[PDB]
């Protein structure tokens, strides 16, 4: 629309964006599980 | 919402990746600074494992 | 109001989304700072669970 | 109109916006319920 | 006045909406800061409910 | 007039604006009643 | 003066409305600051009703 | 004239302006009566 | 002078009105500040009527 | 002339201006009489 | 000099009027401030008539 | 001349200016007489 | 010099008048400040006539 | 010439200027005589 | 994601390379400074191996 | 597309970028293993 | 030199006159300040004639 | 020459300039004689 | 990667050379300064070889 | 490509760049061996 | 040199005259300040002739 | 030449300049002789 | 490399010469200052040869 | 060198003359300040010839 | 190098001359400052020859 | 090429540059040998 | 010439420049001889 | 070339530059010999 992307372009970018964000949240979760095992804060 | 992909027809995907990357880097730096400013979570000055200096 | 959707014919949805995201992030950062600036709700310096340093 | 959006465009954006805001508000309610269980402030 | 709706023929509704939202947010932030600066109404540093730290 | 709005547009915007103001004021009133019950200031 | 309505033929009604709203808001904020800066009229620190903290 | 408003436009704006100002002054008067009952300053 | 009305053929009535209103507001604020900065005329801290706080 | 006003309109503005100034001065005089009764300064 | 009216053929009457009014206002404010900065002529803090506070 | 005013305009402005200055000076003189009666400075 | 009037063919009479008036006003203000800064010539703080405050 | 004034204009401005300066100097001389009578400085 | 290579059709490879190199250099400098600011990990000031000065 | 690169160009740049990033990550991993052997921090 | 009048064919008489007047005024002000900053030549604080204050 | 003045103009300006400077110097000399009589500095 | 030479088709070799030389110079200066700021590695203030001054 | 360099030019520059960087790294390695012999830091 | 007059074909006589006059004035002011800053050559504070204050 | 002056103009300006500088130097020499008689510094 | 001469087809020889000369001068000044800031290598304040002052 | 006059074909004689005059004046002023800052060569405060103040 | 004269085909001889003169003057001033800042090489304060003040 | 120099120009400039750098380095080496003889730092 | 001077102009400027510099140097030398006779610094 | 000078111009400037630099270095050497005879620093 106002970004110049087509609908298919937006839906494939959304898929890749969410996949990458999910992978990033998985490493952050392992990292936080490791940090909780190392030194819990609550 | 199934049509959440339509947000990229509104906000530019490249400007959001740059903002997201920059913001996440700044947030990580800030969290590590906050932890290092504490005594309980400064992993460098905590004494563990046992010091040499 | 059933016609609350008409607000997007006045204020730009993209600018509103950017402002909302930025304001929410700043508000969360400020609230976390305010909680950390206190003694009762500084979860990092509380001594809970029991300290190692 | 003034934003250049169509009425249908505004309606669909409003629907998605309200859904996303409701999801965000629901996550913040659990975050706050968990915080109240952890350490009530009032 | 029954013709109070005519004010939107004079002041831009979108600019008024932006100004009203920004002012209300700033006002709420200011009131919460004023209350937190006091001892009687800082609900965070009040002691209620009973402290852990 | 000088804002580019029609009289009907101004009327309907005023109606929605006042309805939203009433909803916000009611939420604020409930919050202030809760604050007075929690800790009266006068 | 019965012809006091003619003042809107010189000073812009929209500009006057904006200035009046801004000035009234600033005046109210200033009065509240002045009252809170005193001991007699600081309703937050006056100890009425009886304090909990 | 200088503002581009018509005489009828100026008259109607003046009427609505004075009505709104009177309502605001009445609310202010009630608030000040409540403040005087709460804590007289003179 | 009977022809004092001719001054409005020299100084613009709108600018004179704006300047007069702004100057009168500033002057009133200044006088109230001057009175509040004294002890004999600070009606808020004078102790009359008899204090509660 | 220099301001673009007609002679009739300067004489009209002047009448309304002097009436409004007189009303403001009368309100100010009442306020100052009240202030003198409350707390004379001389 | 009977021809002193010719000065308005050199200096603009509107500019002179504006400058004179502004200068006289500033001069009056300055004189009142100088008098208030003294003890003998500060009519607000002089103690006359006899104080209440 | 160099101000764009006519000689008659300059004379009439001078007359009104001097009348207003005399009135202001008389008010100032009365105020200073009152100030000398209140508290002489010399 | 009889031809001293020719100086107005060189320096602008209006600019000269403005500069002279401004300089004389500043000079009078400066002299009054200098006198008030002294003890012997501060007619306000002198004690004459005999004080009330 | 350089200021655009005529020689007659310069002559008459010089006359009025010197007359006004003489009047101002006379007023200043009276003020200084009064100041010397009030409190001599030398 | 197999199509992660398509990110270079969105963000400029040269700008990304420059930003990545600069950020990594600044990050390495910052980490080395943080380590040198601590007693336990300042390998220069530690005493190991045993000192000469 | 938006950067002006071809899809083949983007693919080959991505391959070289990931290879270089893997080499850099392997050197940093060796460096951190050496740092842990020298002086562990946890 | 008898041809000293030729200097006005080089330096503009109007600028020279303005500069001379300004410089002489500044010089007189500076000399009076220097004299007043001394004790022997401060004619206002010297105590002559005999003081009243 | 380079100032726009003619030779006669420069000569007459020089005459008036020197006459005025001589009068100023005479006034200054009288003032300094008075200041020396009042309080010599050397 | 055997195709690492292709990076010079993306980043300008002259700009990279200038930046690399400048960065290496700054890095060397910084390292020498850090070493001099210490006691163990200040080869000038070390005492070795034995002093004369 | 986007730098104006030919592929052969890029290859040649890369070869000379890597040769110069290897020479610099060898000099740096010799200097660090000398610094470790002089005063080891770990 | 007999042809020292040729220097005015190089440096502007008017600019040179202005610079010379300004520099000489500044130099004289500076020398008088230096003399007044000393004790032996401050002719205003030297006590000579014998003081009255 | 470069200043726009004629050779004769430069010669006459140089003559007047050196005459004025000589007069200034003579006045300065008289002032310095008076200063040395008043209070020698060496 | 035998084709190290080709670097001058990339970086301007004049700019490289200017930068090299300026950098070498700055580096030499910095080294001399660093030596003077120490006690062991300040050849001016070392005492060698034996002092006169 | 016999052809040292050719330097004026390179550097502007007027600019060189003005720079030389300004630099020499500044240098003389600096030397006089340096000498006056010393006790041994401040010819004004030396005590020679014998003082009067 | 016998072809060292070709450097003037690259760097402007006039700019080089100006820079060299300025740098040499600044260097000489700096060296004289450094010498005067020391005690052993301050020829003005060294007391040689024997002092008079 | 990019700097506008010819290949022969670049070669000859490189030769002169390396000769001058070698001479400067030799002078620097002599100075450092003299400094080491004067006062060794390691 | 980068300055616009001719060879003859450059030579004749150099002659006057050198002579004036020599005269200035001779005055500085006599001043320095006087300063050494007054208070030698070495 | 780059400076606009001819080869002959560059050679003659180089000759005069080195002659002047040698003269300056000789003066500097004499000054430093005098300084060493006055107060050796090493
Ligand atoms: C169609 O054609 C093209 C070319 C477009 C196809 C290509 C598409 C491609 C290749 C797409 C690629 C997409 C990618 C790589 C997407 C990646 C997305 C990622 C990694 C998203 C990550 C998101 C993370 C978020 C949103 C995190 C948010 C965190 C927040 C808001 C944290 C807040 C913290 C607060 C408020 C307080 C913290 C406590 C403090 C620190 C303040 O105190 C203790
Ligand atoms: C026809 O086509 C279109 C597209 C135009 C139709 C669409 C129309 C639509 C969709 C319209 C939507 C409108 C909306 C959503 C409007 C919402 C309006 C709201 C929520 C308004 C709220 C207003 C609140 C106000 C103005 C509050 C004011 C409070 C004040 C001024 C408080 C002042 C306090 C002071 C000065 C001091 C207090 C004490 C302190 C805080 C200092 O503490 C001691
Ligand atoms: C039709 O074609 C298109 C392309 C347009 C279709 C696409 C549409 C799409 C994809 C739409 C997507 C929409 C989205 C993703 C919307 C998301 C909306 C969200 C998440 C909204 C959230 C809103 C939250 C708000 C407004 C929260 C406000 C909170 C406030 C104002 C809090 C104030 C607090 C105060 C004043 C004081 C607090 C106490 C302090 C911190 C001061 O002290 C303790
Ligand atoms: C013909 O067509 C048109 C459209 C033009 C017709 C319309 C005409 C209309 C509608 C005209 C309307 C006119 C109006 C509304 C005029 C209002 C005029 C007013 C209210 C005038 C008020 C004037 C007040 C004045 C000038 C007060 C002056 C006070 C002074 C200068 C105080 C000075 C105090 C000093 C210097 C020091 C005080 C001591 C302190 C307290 C500062 O410290 C001890
Ligand atoms: C023909 O067509 C047209 C339109 C032109 C006709 C219309 C003409 C009209 C309508 C004309 C209107 C004219 C008006 C209204 C004129 C008003 C004139 C006024 C009010 C003049 C007032 C003048 C006052 C003066 C100049 C006062 C001067 C005071 C001085 C300079 C005081 C100085 C004090 C010093 C330096 C120091 C004192 C002691 C301190 C304050 C420092 O304390 C120790
Ligand atoms: C031909 O057509 C036209 C129109 C041009 C004809 C008209 C011609 C006319 C009308 C011409 C008028 C000419 C006039 C009015 C000329 C007036 C000339 C005057 C009054 C000249 C005055 C000159 C005064 C001078 C130059 C004073 C110089 C003082 C100096 C430099 C003082 C220096 C002091 C020093 C350095 C140190 C002092 C000690 C300190 C204060 C520093 O410490 C104690
Ligand atoms: C042909 O057509 C035309 C129109 C051009 C003909 C007209 C020609 C005319 C009318 C020409 C007029 C020429 C005039 C009036 C010339 C006047 C020349 C004068 C008065 C020259 C005076 C020169 C004085 C000089 C340059 C003095 C220099 C002093 C120096 C540099 C002192 C330095 C002191 C130092 C560095 C340190 C001193 C000690 C400390 C630092 C303590 O002092 C603060
Ligand atoms: C073909 O046509 C033309 C006209 C072009 C032909 C003409 C060609 C000509 C005439 C060419 C002439 C070429 C010339 C004259 C070349 C000269 C080259 C020179 C002198 C090169 C010198 C290079 C020196 C270098 C690169 C030194 C580098 C030193 C470094 C980087 C030092 C770093 C120090 C660090 C990081 C730390 C030190 C520790 C401190 C002391 C700061 O703290 C303890
Ligand atoms: C027809 O064509 C034309 C018009 C061109 C013909 C006309 C030609 C004419 C008329 C030419 C006139 C030429 C003139 C008048 C030339 C005058 C030249 C002069 C007076 C030159 C003087 C030069 C003096 C120099 C360069 C002195 C330099 C001193 C230096 C650099 C000292 C440095 C000291 C240092 C760095 C440190 C010292 C120790 C300190 C001061 C710091 O104390 C510890
Ligand atoms: C063909 O046509 C034309 C017109 C072109 C012919 C004309 C040609 C002409 C007339 C040419 C004239 C040429 C001239 C006059 C050349 C003059 C050249 C000179 C005098 C060169 C002098 C060079 C001096 C140099 C480069 C000195 C360098 C010193 C350095 C780098 C010192 C460094 C010091 C350091 C780093 C540290 C010192 C330690 C301190 C003292 C600062 O702290 C302890
Ligand atoms: C015909 O077509 C159109 C579209 C034009 C028709 C539409 C017309 C419409 C819709 C018109 C709407 C008009 C409205 C909404 C008007 C609202 C007017 C209001 C609310 C007016 C309120 C006025 C309040 C005033 C003027 C208050 C003034 C207060 C002052 C000046 C206080 C000053 C205090 C001072 C200087 C001193 C003491 C206070 C302190 C705080 C210092 O004491 C310690
Ligand atoms: C023909 O057509 C036209 C239109 C041109 C005809 C019209 C002509 C007209 C109407 C002309 C009108 C002219 C007027 C009104 C002229 C007025 C002139 C006046 C009043 C002149 C006044 C002059 C006063 C002077 C010059 C005072 C000077 C004082 C000085 C310079 C004091 C300096 C003091 C110093 C530097 C040192 C000591 C003072 C301190 C304060 C430092 O002591 C402690
Ligand atoms: C087809 O034509 C062309 C020309 C395009 C073909 C050519 C293609 C070529 C030649 C491609 C070449 C590509 C290259 C050389 C790519 C190299 C890529 C590399 C080396 C990537 C490296 C990446 C490293 C990353 C992303 C590291 C990230 C680290 C982060 C974000 C760390 C953050 C830390 C935080 C925020 C918190 C804690 C750290 C602190 C210091 C705070 O802890 C105390
Ligand atoms: C075909 O035509 C042409 C003209 C193109 C042919 C010509 C080609 C030519 C002539 C090419 C010439 C190429 C040259 C001369 C290349 C030279 C390359 C060099 C010397 C490369 C050197 C690279 C060195 C690097 C990248 C070093 C990096 C070091 C880093 C990043 C260090 C970081 C340290 C950190 C962040 C942390 C710790 C350090 C501190 C000090 C903080 O620890 C306490
Ligand atoms: Ca640890
Ligand atoms: Ca915790
Ligand atoms: Ca609480
Ligand atoms: Ca209360
Ligand atoms: Ca009260
Ligand atoms: Ca009173
Ligand atoms: Ca008195
Ligand atoms: Ca170590
Ligand atoms: Ca006296
Ligand atoms: Ca050492
Ligand atoms: Ca004396
Ligand atoms: Ca030594
Ligand atoms: Ca002496
Ligand atoms: Ca000595």
Residue numbers in the entry:
A (entry chain C), D (entry chain b), F (entry chain Z), H (entry chain X), J (entry chain V), L (entry chain T), ...: 6 to 47
B (entry chain D), C (entry chain F), E (entry chain a), G (entry chain Y), I (entry chain W), K (entry chain U), ...: 2 to 54
Provide passages from the article that reported this PDB entry.
Thus, LH1-α1β1 and LH1-α2β1 were used as models of the Ca2+-bound and Ca2+-free complexes, respectively, and their cryo-EM structures were determined at resolutions of 2.45 and 2.78 Å, respectively. However, the overall structures of both LH1 (α1β1) and LH1 (α2β1) complexes are still quite similar, with the main difference residing at the C-terminal region due to the longer sequence of α1 compared with α2. The Qy transition of the LH1-α1β1 and LH1-α1β3 complex (both containing the Ca2+-binding motif) occurred at 894 nm, whereas the Qy of the LH1-α2β1 complex lacking a Ca2+-binding motif was at 888 nm. In the presence of EDTA, the Qy band of Ca2+-bound LH1-α1β1 and LH1-α1β3 complex blueshifted by ~10 nm from 894 nm to 884–886 nm, and the addition of Ca2+ recovered the Qy to 894 nm, similar to results with native Alc. tepidum LH1−RC (reversible shifting from 890 to 882 nm). Collectively, these data indicate that Ca2+-containing Alc. tepidum LH1-only complexes exhibit nearly identical spectral characteristics to the native LH1 complex, and the Ca2+-dependent redshift of the LH1-Qy transition is independent of (or unaffected by) the RC complex. By contrast, the Ca2+-bound LH1-α1β1 and LH1-α1β3 complexes contained mainly anhydrorhodovibrin (C41), a precursor of spirilloxanthin. Among the three complexes, the Ca2+-bound LH1-only complexes demonstrated markedly higher thermal stability than the Ca2+-free counterpart, and within the Ca2+-bound LH1-only complexes, the LH1-α1β3 complex exhibited greater thermal stability than did the LH1-α1β1 complex. For the Ca2+-bound LH1-α1β1 and LH1-α1β3 complexes, a major peak was observed at 80.5 °C and 88.9 °C, respectively.
Here, we use the purple bacterium Rhodospirillum rubrum strain H2 as a host to express Ca2+-bound and Ca2+-free Alc. tepidum LH1-only complexes composed of α- and β-polypeptides that either contain or lack the calcium-binding motif WxxDxI; purified preparations of each complex were then used to test how Ca2+ affects their thermostability and spectral features. In both complexes, each αβ-heterodimer subunit bound two molecules of BChl a and one carotenoid.
